[PDB]
Design a binder for this molecule. Structure first.
Ligand SMILES: Cc1noc(C)c1C[C@@H](C)C(=O)N(C)C
Ligand SMILES: [Zn+2]
Ligand SMILES: [Zn+2]
Ligand SMILES: [Zn+2]
Length: 459
């Protein structure tokens, strides 16, 4: 059962206001025919326009919420809303566009999906709360057939052009007019009581209902993200590499080792409380410190309450030494902390919009992360950039310009002139640091942290 069988039953109750008289007994096979499409017994990679919840979760990067509202149905204008915030008005003759015929609306749909999805996914998944008009509008901008490849590259085709009779992926679709072989899922098939707004609002206060199709589209996608990544979590599902995932993860390991090592050298904490991932490894294996681990999986809904992590009776004394929260998101960090906290507001191809201000960070696995909150860091300060090294000054083995920097904490800088090895290492470390920060990570530290305390570790 890899794909959704076309013979699966589709519940039609949510469609009967736009389509009165619709049969209660309905399959996807009959629904697709009703929508004006013909599948023609084709075993050519596209068995169904609709997909399972499991297939949708694997393709979360392709999710585009889509709603269609009657402005006044072949005789009336339709308002097409997308989770990108775009509203297009199509005439049968929060960005709002005036009424235009389908032949020009379809060109805009292809451009919008292509610009949104080219760096995210090889397809589009329209996330619906299906009431009828959205399904009956698909024939005006969607074409289906066998799975195809792009005319300018090896990627699967996502667009079709009636002008040249050619197919293209999202990267080569300029001037194309039809969406080709899209996928879709109706959230209303999962079992819900009441309307979209009532189900959405139970879990989210960030998306309002300004009474336009894009608002419904955003709410629909947000509800689907809630059901698949907030209430239900799956860290076994792997997502493909689309950007700087590897460099970011390597940079995070590099920065964690640097900051913790320097905090231990500078303040000589006798104990470190490492709170978070139950599979964590000591990030500074050679440190003298008593290293104590506390297990907590990533919180996907609300940030952990510090009172629940630390209290209810273990070292017990979390006030002794220092606490390390490396992506362990809590409501309020204690004053004696070293923290790495993901900023959900960051714009990136890895960070997708999420539920209630949270974001869906997709890097190898999907992590719904609670909304960034500046008040979590009230007992701490921002950690400044610095590079520390006690490794010997020796090159071994890329042309040079001498490094001058007050934040290169090395024996050679203490001595007055940074060596080639430490200049190369400082520049590689600065690039890794900038990669981590630009990915959305934020670093915070106990207020007494002072890099001036590292200079005397060179005796
Ligand atoms: C946890 C967590 N909190 O915010 C984000 C973002 C993550 C996930 C990320 C750090 C990651 O790649 N992990 C754990 C393997
Ligand atoms: Zn292409
Ligand atoms: Zn929402
Ligand atoms: Zn040196």
């Amino acid at each position: 059962p890899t794909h959704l069988s076309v013979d699966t039953k589709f519940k039609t109750e949510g469609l009967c206001v736009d389509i009165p008289g619709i049969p209660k007994d309905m399959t996807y096979r009959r629904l697709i025919s009703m929508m004006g499409f013909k599948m023609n017994y084709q075993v050519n990679g596209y068995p169904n326009m609709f997909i399972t919840r499991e297939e949708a979760i694997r393709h979360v990067r392709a999710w585009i919420g889509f709603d269609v509202e009657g402005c006044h149905g072949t005789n009336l204008p339709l308002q097409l809303g997308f989770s990108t915030g775009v509203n297009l008005v199509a005439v049968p003759t929060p960005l709002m566009y005036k009424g235009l015929p389908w032949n020009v609306v379809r060109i805009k749909i292809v451009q919008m999906l292509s610009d949104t999805l080219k760096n995210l996914s090889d397809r589009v998944v329209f996330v619906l709360w299906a009431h009828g008009f959205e399904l009956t509008s698909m024939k005006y901008f969607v074409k289906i057939g066998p799975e195809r490849t792009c005319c300018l590259c090896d990627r699967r085709a996502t667009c079709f052009s009636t002008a040249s009779d050619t197919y293209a992926c999202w990267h080569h679709s300029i001037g194309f007019d039809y969406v080709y072989n899209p996928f879709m899922i109706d959230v209303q098939q999962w079992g819900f009581t009441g309307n979209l707004q009532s189900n959405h609002d139970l879990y989210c206060q960030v998306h309002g209902n300004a009474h336009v199709a894009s608002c419904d589209a955003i709410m629909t996608r947000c509800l689907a993200v809630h059901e698949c990544f907030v209430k239900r979590v799956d860290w076994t599902i792997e997502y493909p590499i689309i950007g700087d995932e590897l460099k970011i993860n390597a940079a995070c390991r590099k920065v964690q080792h640097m900051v913790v090592k320097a905090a231990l050298l500078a303040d000589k904490f006798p104990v470190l409380h490492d709170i978070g991932n139950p599979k964590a490894i000591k990030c500074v294996p050679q440190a003298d410190v008593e290293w104590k681990f506390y297990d907590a999986q990533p919180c996907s809904d609300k940030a952990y309450k510090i009172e629940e992590l630390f209290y209810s009776y273990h070292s017990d004394k979390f006030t002794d030494g220092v606490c390390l929260f490396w992506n362990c998101n809590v409501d309020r960090y204690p004053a004696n902390s070293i923290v790495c906290r993901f900023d959900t507001r960051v714009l990136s191809n890895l960070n997708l919009p999420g539920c209630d201000g949270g974001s869906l960070y997709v890097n190898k696995h999907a992590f719904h992360t609670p909304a960034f909150d500046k008040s979590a860091f009230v007992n701490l300060k921002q950690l400044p950039f610095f590079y520390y090294s006690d490794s010997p000054c020796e090159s071994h083995g890329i042309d040079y310009v001498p490094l001058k920097s007050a934040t290169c904490i090395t024996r050679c800088n203490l001595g007055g002139a940074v060596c080639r090895h430490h200049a190369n290492e400082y520049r590689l470390y600065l690039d890794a640091y900038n990669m981590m920060i630009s990915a959305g990570f934020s670093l915070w530290v106990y207020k007494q942290f002072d890099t001036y305390n590292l200079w005397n570790t060179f005796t």
